[PDB]
Short mmCIF file of C-alpha atoms in Angstrom, two decimals:
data_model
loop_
_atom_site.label_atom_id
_atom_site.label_comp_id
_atom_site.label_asym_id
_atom_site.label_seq_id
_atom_site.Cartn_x
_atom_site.Cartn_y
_atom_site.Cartn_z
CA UNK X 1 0.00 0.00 0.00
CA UNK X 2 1.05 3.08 -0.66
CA UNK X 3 0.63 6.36 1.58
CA UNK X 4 0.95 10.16 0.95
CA UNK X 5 1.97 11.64 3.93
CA UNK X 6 1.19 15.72 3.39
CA UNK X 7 1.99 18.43 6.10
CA UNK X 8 -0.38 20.74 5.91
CA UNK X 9 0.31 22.75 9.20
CA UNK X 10 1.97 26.54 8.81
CA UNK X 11 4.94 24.58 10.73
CA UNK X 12 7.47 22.58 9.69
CA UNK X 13 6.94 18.53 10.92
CA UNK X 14 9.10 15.62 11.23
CA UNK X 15 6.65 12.92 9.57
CA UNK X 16 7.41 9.37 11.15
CA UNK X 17 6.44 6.16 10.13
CA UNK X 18 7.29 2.61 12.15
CA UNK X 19 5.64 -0.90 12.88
CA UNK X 20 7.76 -0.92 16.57
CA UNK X 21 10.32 -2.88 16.05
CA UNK X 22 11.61 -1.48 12.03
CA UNK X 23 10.83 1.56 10.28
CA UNK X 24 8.49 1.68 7.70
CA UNK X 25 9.70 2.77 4.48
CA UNK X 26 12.31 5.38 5.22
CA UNK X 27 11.03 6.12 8.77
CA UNK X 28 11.16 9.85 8.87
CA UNK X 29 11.52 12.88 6.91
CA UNK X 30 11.09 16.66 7.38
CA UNK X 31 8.00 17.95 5.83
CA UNK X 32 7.66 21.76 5.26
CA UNK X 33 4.57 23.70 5.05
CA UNK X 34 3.03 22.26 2.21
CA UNK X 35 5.43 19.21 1.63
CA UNK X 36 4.42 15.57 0.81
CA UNK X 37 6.02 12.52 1.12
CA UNK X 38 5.21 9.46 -0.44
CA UNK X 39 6.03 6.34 1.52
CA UNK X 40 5.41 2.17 0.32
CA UNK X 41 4.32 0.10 3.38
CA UNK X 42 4.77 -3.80 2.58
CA UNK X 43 1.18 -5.82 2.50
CA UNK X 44 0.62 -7.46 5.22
CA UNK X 45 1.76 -4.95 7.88
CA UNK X 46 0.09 -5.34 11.56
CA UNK X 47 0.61 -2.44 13.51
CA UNK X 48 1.69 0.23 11.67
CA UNK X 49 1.49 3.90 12.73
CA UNK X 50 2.19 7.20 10.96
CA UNK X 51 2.49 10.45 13.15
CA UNK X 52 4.36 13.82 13.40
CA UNK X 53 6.78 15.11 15.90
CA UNK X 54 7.07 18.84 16.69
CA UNK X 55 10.88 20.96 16.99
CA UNK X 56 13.41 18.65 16.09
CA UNK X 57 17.02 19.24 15.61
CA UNK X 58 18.89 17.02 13.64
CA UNK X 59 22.97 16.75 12.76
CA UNK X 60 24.10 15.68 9.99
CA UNK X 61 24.12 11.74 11.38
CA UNK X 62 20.05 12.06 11.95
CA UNK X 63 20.32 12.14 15.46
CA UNK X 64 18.96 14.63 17.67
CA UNK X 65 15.61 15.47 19.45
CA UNK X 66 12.13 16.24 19.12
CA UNK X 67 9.98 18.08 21.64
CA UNK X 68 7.12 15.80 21.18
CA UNK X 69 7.05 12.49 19.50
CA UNK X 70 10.86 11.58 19.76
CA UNK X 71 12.14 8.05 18.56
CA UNK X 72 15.05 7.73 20.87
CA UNK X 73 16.81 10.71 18.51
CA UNK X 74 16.79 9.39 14.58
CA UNK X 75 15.48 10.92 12.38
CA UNK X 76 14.45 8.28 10.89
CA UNK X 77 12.41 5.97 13.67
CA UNK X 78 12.30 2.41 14.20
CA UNK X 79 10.40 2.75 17.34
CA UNK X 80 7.67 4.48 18.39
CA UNK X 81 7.63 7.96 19.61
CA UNK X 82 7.17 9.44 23.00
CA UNK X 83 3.76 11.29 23.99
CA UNK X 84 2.41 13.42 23.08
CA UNK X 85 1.21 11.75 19.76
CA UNK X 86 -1.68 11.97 17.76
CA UNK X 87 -1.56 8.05 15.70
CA UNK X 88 -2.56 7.26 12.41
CA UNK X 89 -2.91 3.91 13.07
CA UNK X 90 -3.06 0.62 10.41
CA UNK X 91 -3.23 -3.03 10.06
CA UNK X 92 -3.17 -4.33 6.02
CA UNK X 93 -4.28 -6.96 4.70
CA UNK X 94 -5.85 -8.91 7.77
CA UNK X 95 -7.91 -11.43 6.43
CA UNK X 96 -8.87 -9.58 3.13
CA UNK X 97 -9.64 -6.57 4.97
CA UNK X 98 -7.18 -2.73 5.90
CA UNK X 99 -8.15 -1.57 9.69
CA UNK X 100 -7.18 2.09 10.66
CA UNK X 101 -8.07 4.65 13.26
CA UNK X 102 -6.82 7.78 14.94
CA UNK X 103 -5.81 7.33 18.72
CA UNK X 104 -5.16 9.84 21.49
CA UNK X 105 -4.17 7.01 23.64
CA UNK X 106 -0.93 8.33 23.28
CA UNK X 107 -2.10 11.88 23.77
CA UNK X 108 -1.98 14.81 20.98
CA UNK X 109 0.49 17.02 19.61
CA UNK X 110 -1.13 17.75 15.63
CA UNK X 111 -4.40 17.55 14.27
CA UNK X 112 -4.55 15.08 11.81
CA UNK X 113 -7.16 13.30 9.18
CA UNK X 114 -6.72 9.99 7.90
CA UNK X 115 -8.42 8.84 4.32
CA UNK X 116 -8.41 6.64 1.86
CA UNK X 117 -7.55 7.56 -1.59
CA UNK X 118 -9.32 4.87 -3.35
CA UNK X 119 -12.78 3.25 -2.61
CA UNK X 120 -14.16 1.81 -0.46
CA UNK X 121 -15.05 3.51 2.77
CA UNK X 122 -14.36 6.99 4.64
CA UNK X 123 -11.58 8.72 6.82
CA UNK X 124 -11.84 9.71 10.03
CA UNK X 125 -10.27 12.80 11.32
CA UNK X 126 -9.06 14.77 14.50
CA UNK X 127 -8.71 18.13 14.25
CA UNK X 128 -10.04 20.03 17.35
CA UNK X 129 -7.90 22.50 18.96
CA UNK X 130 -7.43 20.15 21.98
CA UNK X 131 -3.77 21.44 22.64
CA UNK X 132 -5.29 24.81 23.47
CA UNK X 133 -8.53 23.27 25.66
CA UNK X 134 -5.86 20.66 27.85
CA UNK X 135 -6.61 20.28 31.03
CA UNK X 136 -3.78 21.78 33.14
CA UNK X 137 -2.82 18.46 34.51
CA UNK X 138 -1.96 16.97 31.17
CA UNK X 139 -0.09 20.29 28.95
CA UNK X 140 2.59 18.86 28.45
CA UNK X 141 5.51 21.21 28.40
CA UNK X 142 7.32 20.19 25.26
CA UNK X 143 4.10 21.23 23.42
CA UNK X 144 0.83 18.72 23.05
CA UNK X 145 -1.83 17.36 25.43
CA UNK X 146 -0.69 14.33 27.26
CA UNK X 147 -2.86 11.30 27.50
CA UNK X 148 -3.56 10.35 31.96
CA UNK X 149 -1.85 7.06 31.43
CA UNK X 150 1.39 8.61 30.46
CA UNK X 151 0.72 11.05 33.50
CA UNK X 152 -0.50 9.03 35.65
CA UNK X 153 0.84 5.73 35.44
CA UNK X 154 -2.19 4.10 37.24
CA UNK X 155 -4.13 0.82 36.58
CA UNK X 156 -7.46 2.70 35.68
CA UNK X 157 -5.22 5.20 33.24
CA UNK X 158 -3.00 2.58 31.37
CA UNK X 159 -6.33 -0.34 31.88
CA UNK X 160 -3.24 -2.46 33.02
CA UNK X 161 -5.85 -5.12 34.08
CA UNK X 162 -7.76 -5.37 31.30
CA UNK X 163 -10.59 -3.83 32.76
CA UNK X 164 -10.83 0.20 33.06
CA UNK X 165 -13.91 2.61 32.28
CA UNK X 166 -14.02 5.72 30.56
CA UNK X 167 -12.32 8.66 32.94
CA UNK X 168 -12.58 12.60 33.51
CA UNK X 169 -9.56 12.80 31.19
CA UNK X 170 -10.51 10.69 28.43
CA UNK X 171 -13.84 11.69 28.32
CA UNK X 172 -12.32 15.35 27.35
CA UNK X 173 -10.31 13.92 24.37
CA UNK X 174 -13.61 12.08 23.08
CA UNK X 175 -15.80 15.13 23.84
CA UNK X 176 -13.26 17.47 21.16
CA UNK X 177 -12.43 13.86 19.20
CA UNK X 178 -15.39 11.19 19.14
CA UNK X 179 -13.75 9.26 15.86
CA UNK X 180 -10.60 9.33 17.61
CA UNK X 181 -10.12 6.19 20.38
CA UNK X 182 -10.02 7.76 23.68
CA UNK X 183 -8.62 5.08 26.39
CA UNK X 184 -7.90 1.84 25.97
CA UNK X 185 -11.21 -0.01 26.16
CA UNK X 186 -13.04 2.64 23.99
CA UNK X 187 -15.93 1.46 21.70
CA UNK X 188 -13.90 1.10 18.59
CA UNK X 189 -13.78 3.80 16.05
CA UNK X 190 -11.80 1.84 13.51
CA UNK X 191 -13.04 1.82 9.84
CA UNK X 192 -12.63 -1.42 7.64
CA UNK X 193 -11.21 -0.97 4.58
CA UNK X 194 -10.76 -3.17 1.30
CA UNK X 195 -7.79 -4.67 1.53
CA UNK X 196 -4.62 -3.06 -0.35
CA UNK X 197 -6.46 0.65 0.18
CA UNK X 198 -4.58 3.32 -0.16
CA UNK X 199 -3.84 6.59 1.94
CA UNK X 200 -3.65 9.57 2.56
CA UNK X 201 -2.41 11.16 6.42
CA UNK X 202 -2.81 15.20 5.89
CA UNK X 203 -1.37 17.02 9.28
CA UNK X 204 -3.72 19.93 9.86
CA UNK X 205 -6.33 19.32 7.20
CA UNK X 206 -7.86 22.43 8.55
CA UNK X 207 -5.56 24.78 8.92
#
């Protein structure tokens, strides 16, 4: 599958892509205002996610830091990023079927909408200002709205027992994001694609 990966913010990004344990395509890439970048993710792929991280420097080597959404310092990740992150999220190909979603488990740092380019169902999108609306508790100071887990660190946060409810925190996420997956036991927002779809991850689709 292919995905164009377009940075629509007025700021300059640092697109990532990784399945956790290899980078996907490239891994990561500076997107200016405007830029796209057009990355080929093998079929097949469980666990993929796509997001942006916000004032990076890099050297010449690739390593540095990002203030939110750092992969241990490449530039081009193999892991995931630290919250804050808004995820594009995507399994391919499971069972003759694409599954993706948008997840503030991980907290948010840019809005984001994530759509298929050919047919076959819709996007889904989050692009509320919920940086500006955070409750104090979670700003985080890098920039971004942290999710309570990553806060926290409790069982009812993280749902380290497998059971959990909906909280004060995530309910605020779902309230600005409701097709955006809130905590970890949320009622699934994933949509269910053809398999081989392809994509399109626009940062700031509305500004």
């Amino acid at each position: 599958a292919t995905f164009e990966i377009v940075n629509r913010c007025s700021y300059t990004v640092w697109a990532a892509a990784s399945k956790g344990d290899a980078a996907l395509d490239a891994g990561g890439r500076q997107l200016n205002s405007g830029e796209s970048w057009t990355i080929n993710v093998e079929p097949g792929t469980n666990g993929g996610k796509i997001w942006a991280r916000t004032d990076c420097y890099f050297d010449d080597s690739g390593s540095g830091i990002c203030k939110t959404g750092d992969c241990g310092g490449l530039l081009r990740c193999k892991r995931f990023g630290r919250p804050p992150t808004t995820l594009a999220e995507f399994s391919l190909n499971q069972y003759g079927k694409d599954y993706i979603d948008i997840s503030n488990i991980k907290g948010f740092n840019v809005p984001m909408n994530f759509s298929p380019t050919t047919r076959g169902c819709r996007g889904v999108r989050c692009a509320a200002d919920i940086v500006g609306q955070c409750p104090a508790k979670l700003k985080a100071p890098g920039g971004g709205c942290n999710d309570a887990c990553t806060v926290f660190q409790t069982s009812e946060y993280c749902c380290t027992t497998g059971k959990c409810g909906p909280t004060e925190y995530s309910r605020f996420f779902k309230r600005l994001c409701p097709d955006a997956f809130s905590y970890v036991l949320d009622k699934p927002t994933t949509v269910t694609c053809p398999g081989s779809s392809n994509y399109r991850v626009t940062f700031c689709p509305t500004a």
